[PDB]
C-alpha cells in the first residue's frame, strides 16, 4: 500500500563502517559517517509522525 508516508530508517550503519554509526546531520546536513564521513540523505522534512504519547484530548 502506498498510503503510508515513509516511516523508513536509513541503512544499518555505514556500508563500509559497521562501527561508524552515521550521525544525524553532517555538520548541519544529512547522515555523516564519522569514519568515511559520508553524507546520506536529502530533504527529510521530518517524516514518521506516530504521536507516541500518553492519554489524548482530541
Q: Which residues are annotated as a binding site?
A: 14, 17, 33, 36, 52
For the record, the C-alpha cell of 36 comes out as 568515511
CA distances from 24 to 2, 3, 40, 56, 57 (A): 27, 27, 9, 30, 33
Task: Look up residue 19 and give its DSSP letter.
Answer: S
Q: List, as residue ranges, the binding site for DNA.
A: 52
Q: List, as residue ranges, the binding site for Zn(2+).
A: 14, 17, 33, 36
Amino acid at each position: 500500500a502506498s498510503t503510508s508516508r515513509l516511516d523508513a530508517l536509513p541503512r544499518v550503519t555505514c556500508p563500509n563502517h559497521p562501527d561508524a554509526i552515521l550521525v544525524e546531520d553532517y555538520r548541519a546536513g544529512d547522515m555523516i559517517c564519522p569514519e568515511c564521513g559520508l553524507v546520506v540523505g536529502d530533504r527529510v522534512i521530518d517524516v514518521g509522525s506516530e504521536w507516541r504519547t500518553f492519554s489524548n484530548d482530541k
